[PDB]
Design an enzyme around this catalytic site. Structure first.
Site, PDB file in Angstrom:
ATOM      1  N   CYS A  74       0.713  -1.124   0.159  1.00 29.06           N
ATOM      2  CA  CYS A  74       0.044  -0.289   0.041  1.00 29.06           C
ATOM      3  C   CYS A  74       1.158   1.831   0.050  1.00 29.06           C
ATOM      4  O   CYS A  74       0.335   1.683  -0.882  1.00 29.06           O
ATOM      5  CB  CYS A  74      -1.140  -0.315   1.353  1.00 29.06           C
ATOM      6  SG  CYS A  74      -0.181  -0.055   3.009  1.00 29.06           S
ATOM      7  N   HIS A 132      -3.236   1.788   7.125  1.00 30.87           N
ATOM      8  CA  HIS A 132      -3.118   1.135   5.581  1.00 30.87           C
ATOM      9  C   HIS A 132      -3.380   3.062   5.211  1.00 30.87           C
ATOM     10  O   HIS A 132      -3.849   3.674   5.155  1.00 30.87           O
ATOM     11  CB  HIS A 132      -4.537   0.880   5.528  1.00 30.87           C
ATOM     12  CG  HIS A 132      -5.091   0.885   3.669  1.00 30.87           C
ATOM     13  ND1 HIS A 132      -4.130   0.276   2.724  1.00 30.87           N
ATOM     14  CD2 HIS A 132      -5.541   1.224   2.957  1.00 30.87           C
ATOM     15  CE1 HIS A 132      -4.760  -0.196   1.620  1.00 30.87           C
ATOM     16  NE2 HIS A 132      -5.693   0.704   1.831  1.00 30.87           N
ATOM     17  N   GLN A 151      -5.002   3.196  -4.126  1.00 27.85           N
ATOM     18  CA  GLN A 151      -4.722   1.539  -3.446  1.00 27.85           C
ATOM     19  C   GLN A 151      -4.148   0.662  -3.790  1.00 27.85           C
ATOM     20  O   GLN A 151      -4.739   0.557  -4.997  1.00 27.85           O
ATOM     21  CB  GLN A 151      -5.768   1.689  -2.385  1.00 27.85           C
ATOM     22  CG  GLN A 151      -7.066   1.117  -2.470  1.00 27.85           C
ATOM     23  CD  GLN A 151      -7.947   1.090  -1.754  1.00 27.85           C
ATOM     24  OE1 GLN A 151      -7.230  -0.063  -0.724  1.00 27.85           O
ATOM     25  NE2 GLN A 151      -8.642   0.424  -2.242  1.00 27.85           N
TER      26      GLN A 151
END
Length: 248
Positions: A74, A132, A151
């Site tokens: 990520c 994240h 993403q």
């Protein structure tokens, strides 16, 4: 003027190229992404492989073939696409800027409400509840101002594994209302029911908008969100992509 859907499909193309992949997902954060040199990147790989006695021996000692394409986690994808969008003449170090230019999820919500529709902005989001990192692209628009999420995800948190190209191919092209993003990133997110939490997360971040793909017990309840929000020039985003394609 600039075709913005093609920008994303060109990122996908670059990722799919064996040599484009190495340009795009390199981890040099301090220098301009367009300052990246294929010969130099591959020479560093070659020398590391020769030093260990060749490819078969390297794979035995390291467990990876370093010539294989990278499937970026990520932070690797988000920070690289961020450089692609934000760099003109000067480099943008997203590691440095995330720490020095940080605002919180509630400050974000106050900011987004007064962005000029005549300008383009991008947010680099480190969601510490999810562990994240992702991007929200908020491009200039003569209609409703909306965000698009870029993403990838190794899959070790609340969401499933997600490959950058699979996400970008379609969901990365889905507009998200500013209100949904504000709700997602605000501290008040915690006050939502489990069902609403799964709905909001799945709607914005899951490939299939599937609530059963969200594992709330993997989320760190107490944490907030660190955001670096900056203006960008879509002409730089376009030309930076062109520059990498040319390098090939």
């Amino acid at each position: 003027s600039i075709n913005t859907i093609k920008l994303i499909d060109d990122i996908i193309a670059l990722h799919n190229d064996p040599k484009g992949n190495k340009l795009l997902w390199n981890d040099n954060w301090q220098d301009k992404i367009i300052n990246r040199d294929l010969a130099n990147i591959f020479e560093k790989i070659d020398e590391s492989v020769s030093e260990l006695g060749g490819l078969e021996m390297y794979q035995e000692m390291v467990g990876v073939n370093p010539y294989d394409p990278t499937e970026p986690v990520c932070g690797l994808s988000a920070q690289n696409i961020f450089k692609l969008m934000t760099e003109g003449e000067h480099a943008v170090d997203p590691v440095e800027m995330a720490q020095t230019g940080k605002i919180d999820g509630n400050e974000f919500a106050e900011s987004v409400d007064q962005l000029s529709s005549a300008k383009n902005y991008v947010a680099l989001v480190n969601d510490r509840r999810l562990g994240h990192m992702f991007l929200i692209d908020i491009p200039s628009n003569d209609q409703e101002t909306v965000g698009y999420i870029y993403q990838s995800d190794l899959g070790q948190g609340a969401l499933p594994p997600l490959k950058i190209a699979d996400w970008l191919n379609s969901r990365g092209k889905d507009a998200v209302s500013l209100n949904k993003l504000k709700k997602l990133l605000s501290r008040e997110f915690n006050l939502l029911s489990d069902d609403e939490k799964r709905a909001l997360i799945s709607e914005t971040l899951d490939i299939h908008k599937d609530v059963s793909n969200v594992e709330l017990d993997r989320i760190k309840r107490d944490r907030g969100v660190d955001i670096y929000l900056t203006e960008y020039d879509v002409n730089n985003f376009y030309e930076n992509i062109e520059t990498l394609k040319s390098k090939l």
